[PDB]
Design a binder for this molecule. Sequence first.
Ligand code: ZN
Lengths: 69, 195
Amino acid sequence: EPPPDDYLMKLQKQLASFQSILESGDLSINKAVENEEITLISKALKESTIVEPIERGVAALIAFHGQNE
Amino acid sequence: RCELKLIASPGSWRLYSARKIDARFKSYEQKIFQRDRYTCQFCGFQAALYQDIVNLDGDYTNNRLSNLVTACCFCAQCFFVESVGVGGYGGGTLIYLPELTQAELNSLCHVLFCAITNDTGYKSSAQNIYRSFKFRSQIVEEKFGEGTSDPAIFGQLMIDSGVNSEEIREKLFKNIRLLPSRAKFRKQIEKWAAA
Ligand SMILES: [Zn+2]
């Protein structure tokens, strides 16, 4: 169970990398992406007229399945 | 509609975790559940079991009722990123998902997980969506390094680096979502359906 003994040095290493990102002034992921399944379920959630969120997700999954198909 | 955000802080989870077994807490805990109709104030998920109480100002020494809201466990763990999957506390993966808000993702995942545990015909579609979500962890690690889609790692990096300001936290977590773990929540997912 105890983590491998390189843990402390890996943490310090990972922290030094995170630190240079902090100093870059480029902190965010700004990537253009496209996945058909993510696009479809987001489009269904967006175009829904259902107000309550759990019910909106219920109908969106059904419309996803019918359109995928 | 309360505001969901990803928070990594050194000691909030410890105060929140200790409060949870305090006896004075269980008194007013039921008042909040009753006030909110056992409904998560972030994603809308309703359940009699396993609901949590989170503090709007993030200050777990301020437990006046007007600072407390009901929260399901997918939403509650967003406020303790550094503790997710630590010691059996919840579980999840950081993903790049600009297409959904965290609240939208959480209410959808309740729907997806129910559709997967109790197949009525939509398990496959629900698995396809959840797997496309989980795949988006790789974009987080391409930016921040190997392993950093683990929220416990990412949150420890922020804390140990001294990340203090809201402005920096907002940038680091921009379009990143904590995707709840279907595997780690199997006890809750099944018990929610029977109950
Ligand atoms: Zn919720």
